[PDB]
Amino acid sequence: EEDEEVLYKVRAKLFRFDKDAKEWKERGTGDCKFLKNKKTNKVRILMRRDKTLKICANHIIAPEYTLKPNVGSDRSWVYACTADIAEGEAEAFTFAIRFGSKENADKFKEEFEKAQEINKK
């Protein structure tokens, strides 16, 4: 993280979708960060759990992804990720991320969309 700049910090709770058993499952609660690499100009999401400080999210904010809404929340988003190296090996997850307020959901989104514009260059 010494070679990266923090673009956005917001407190959040992350979920992943279990396919076989139709339900959402918590993966972490902590500070979700937007980290632009100063050498490659590539932005990524990195999010660690509170207290234990373990990685529940680690992927590039690909320009392909779209933040869809959830049926049950006005302060959350849900999107597909193809390569998350949080648990180690690359793996395709359908993530949901929820925030404190609506403004925290909407601020996240515009920053996320700004992040994708930085990545395309």
Binding site: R11, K19, K22, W24, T29, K51, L53, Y79, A80, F99
Partner: protein, 202 residues
């Protein structure tokens, strides 16, 4: 650097739920009884490097007890767990302790009062004193609200490694990689499946 940890306590106290939270981060709402014991590896990263735990999640309910105290052989640490919303589970702590310390004669042990997030608490603060004479660390925890959920393992890590200044530290994270029919169907199911606990702060 790996250590055998046994987790013992009454049925329903939230043992397997406590471990699951530490494994994946999830909060399992449902009570599926553990049958005998479940062995799960659990690595923490510290300033003294990575510590590993073989977490033997033993059964609480008598009928599903399996090998019982046979699970305790060569255990280097332990967690005794009870439910602060259930007084009977605290009265049984000494029975669990008795069984445990008969096999494991000298090991660090944490007593834990689970489910403190529940408003209507029954096992009051003052009442909890069994840990003192038997040299056990105590912690109020909540597997749901994550209250002091890190404490049992952090304290055991300090006792086993032998460094009282052992703090958890962040894993220097590698830069992630730069990478279609089923995807569309799977996402739709996700949006229309409502997120749990929508009346939490997060």
């Amino acid at each position: 650097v790996q250590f055998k940890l046994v987790l013992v306590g009454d049925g329903g106290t939230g043992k397997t739920t406590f471990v699951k939270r530490h494994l994946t981060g999830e909060f399992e709402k449902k009570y599926v009884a553990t049958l005998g014991v479940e062995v799960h590896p659990l690595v923490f990263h510290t300033n003294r490097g990575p510590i590993k735990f073989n977490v033997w999640d033993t059964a609480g309910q008598e009928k599903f007890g399996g090998l019982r105290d046979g699970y305790y052989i060569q255990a280097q640490c332990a967690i005794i767990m009870f439910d602060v919303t259930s007084r009977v589970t605290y009265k049984n702590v000494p029975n669990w302790h008795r069984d445990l310390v008969r096999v494991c004669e000298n090991i660090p042990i944490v007593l834990c009062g689970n489910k403190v997030d529940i408003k209507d608490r029954k096992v009051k603060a003052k009442s909890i004193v069994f840990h003192r004479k038997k040299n056990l660390q105590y912690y109020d925890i909540s597997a749901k609200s994550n209250y002091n959920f890190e404490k049992p393992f952090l304290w055991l890590a300090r006792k086993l490694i032998g460094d009282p200044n052992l703090e958890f530290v962040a894993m220097p994270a590698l830069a992630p990689p730069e990478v279609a029919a089923q995807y569309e169907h799977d996402l739709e199911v996700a949006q229309t499946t409502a997120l749990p606990d929508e009346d939490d702060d997060l």
